[PDB]
Design an enzyme around this catalytic site. Sequence first.
Site, PDB file in Angstrom:
ATOM      1  CG  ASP A  90      -0.328   0.037   2.556  1.00  0.00           C
ATOM      2  OD1 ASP A  90       0.556  -0.822   2.857  1.00  0.00           O
ATOM      3  OD2 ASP A  90      -0.715   0.889   3.346  1.00  0.00           O
ATOM      4  CD  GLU A 136       4.109   1.142   7.254  1.00  0.00           C
ATOM      5  OE1 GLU A 136       3.830   1.870   6.256  1.00  0.00           O
ATOM      6  OE2 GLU A 136       4.757   1.558   8.243  1.00  0.00           O
TER       7      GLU A 136
END
EC number: 3.5.1.18
Lengths: 375, 375
Positions: B69, B134
């Site tokens: 991500d 994250e």
Amino acid sequence: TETQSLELAKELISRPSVTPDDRDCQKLLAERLHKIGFAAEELHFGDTKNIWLRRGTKAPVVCFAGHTDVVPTGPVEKWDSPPFEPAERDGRLYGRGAADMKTSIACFVTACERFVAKHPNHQGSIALLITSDEEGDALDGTTKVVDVLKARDELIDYCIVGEPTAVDKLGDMIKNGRRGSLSGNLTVKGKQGHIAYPHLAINPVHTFAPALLELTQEVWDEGNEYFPPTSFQISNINGGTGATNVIPGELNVKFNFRFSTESTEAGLKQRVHAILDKHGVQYDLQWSCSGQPFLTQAGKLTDVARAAIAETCGIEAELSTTGGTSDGRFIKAIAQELIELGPSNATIHQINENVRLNDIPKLSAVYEGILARLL
Amino acid sequence: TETQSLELAKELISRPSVTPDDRDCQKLLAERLHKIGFAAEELHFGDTKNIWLRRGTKAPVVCFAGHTDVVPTGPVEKWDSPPFEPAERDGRLYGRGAADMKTSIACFVTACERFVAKHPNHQGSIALLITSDEEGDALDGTTKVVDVLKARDELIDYCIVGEPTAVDKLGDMIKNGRRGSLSGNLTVKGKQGHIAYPHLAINPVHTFAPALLELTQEVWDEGNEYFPPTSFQISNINGGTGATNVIPGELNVKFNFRFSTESTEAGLKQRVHAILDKHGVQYDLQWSCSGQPFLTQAGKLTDVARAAIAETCGIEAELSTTGGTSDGRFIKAIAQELIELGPSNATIHQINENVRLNDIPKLSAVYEGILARLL
Ligand SMILES: [Zn+2]
Ligand SMILES: [Zn+2]
Ligand SMILES: [Zn+2]
Ligand SMILES: [Zn+2]
């Protein structure tokens, strides 16, 4: 004892004259006093209505000052009886404006009626200076009327502002002046960044902290026989983006002084800038001063008010400058001596605002005693 | 020198995998490494995708960890070239995720391919622990995978987290640990009132002021050979109703510690409460701790990383614990030694994010050198 003050206070209170609206309260007063020789002069500015009523053409000129506007009621169902339906209950009169300040106005008007009837050839002049905006920002109310009067040299010897001044019993306190008010809007500048790299940011809360402590601990002056010490208070402080992992770029602080004659506007500002500069703070600061302190020292007017209160209420009135302010801050420019005197201010601006019914004819008789001792 | 890392970094970056979306980046990685003996295990939780890829069944187990991500781009027209159309320009590769952290992932995957090809009978095991959250609140990403691995006793000897760690040149800095993070939400209680009657109110800005100064001046610890001093920072402060003639009833302050192993969570909290209590502050305080500090002291893994960097980049890597944090704070629970190592973090989370093109095959060759020294 007369009941005329009570019933006039009722008709005034029944008018919902939320600032800056008057609801013809001023018209009612003008039409009533016209019957006993008061000439009326309307002075409208912006959305604000003002009236200068006057009987007589020579000195000494005694002025009653006051306002017909009231603050908003809040949700009406929270009131025990409706705020614009004046009700007698438990020896009190309940309603918006009952204390601030329609009852005063009613008491003075009836006092004029009784005085003029007993002394139709009295010396001097009696005037009423009434505005429909004292409770709001007050840009077009009394301050404009004063400028008109001052421009044509129509000066006042003695002024009584009918604001509620009593702590508990009517007459226990008279105001012979008020604090000035000086406000600051401070923007402390830092540099925004991620909280985990403080060496690449400047936290304006941390830079301001030592000055803030010095400001909130500072003794500004010790006051004097008429004023309490100058007071500094923070009203607002706001800084941050809402993220808990960011150091804000700036911090906004709003503060105010209510200051006595022991300190000056310019002196306070210099002291504040000096505190911030000595701690290395980087900032913008905008100032605004909405009034200077004013004071009528012990004299004939204070003596006369005390003596009338002693006669009617049986107590010794204390002189005070504490609390907020009034339109006296404008009128003192053209009034040689000015005091404020009215009922208990315990419930002003609150729900179930009221005045003791027994204080109503007493207040009016105090005003009448003042008129008789001055005229 | 190989160009395989570059082109894989491009296809990853071209996927708009804004948290918690993966856009099949994990599927791409799994299908590619399946060709050389990596078994794939999907571990999905909530909206977050996680993958645990592994080749080999015995110790030592070397793990690469990272995330697919990326943070949001912002208004796209502010970029010089589109954030999800990776572009080569001025010796750099531009795009969202170019530095954080898709290029690392691409470099490690190609390193695995070259290592396994040159040493098909190597000892131990190679694993990849990849998450699609994250950058957000990270409740369903690596922390869940670690709990699954720990529950079935699947432990790691050496872990390399591919976060970007370089200051300027690739290899100049390795992270061997991170600070913990402890956050406080403080509500200082006062009593609201009109600013002109401070004796009937309690100003929470004034009551807090002496504690705030003591907090922002406090030395928490001096750090040690691995950590900088514990850092305290205010992120937000908010108090007031917006009226400049009211003293607020309460003040809200948000603060954070990034703390080293010299201080403990419990110790910091006690110190903060002691400062506030000694100044007589009345308050509520809610705490939250999103991570403990973690540290891998000098050992084989740091030695090996330094030696590979010396060989490939020609420089001496420094060990550091500074900055923010990573998924290492979860993985260290099951990894005996863990380091982070990646490209420059200068442009992470910013517009025109990029990595030097010459650093790409160097990073991959560093990872390959690490694998060879450990396996
Ligand atoms: Zn008033
Ligand atoms: Zn008022
Ligand atoms: Zn990252
Ligand atoms: Zn990131």
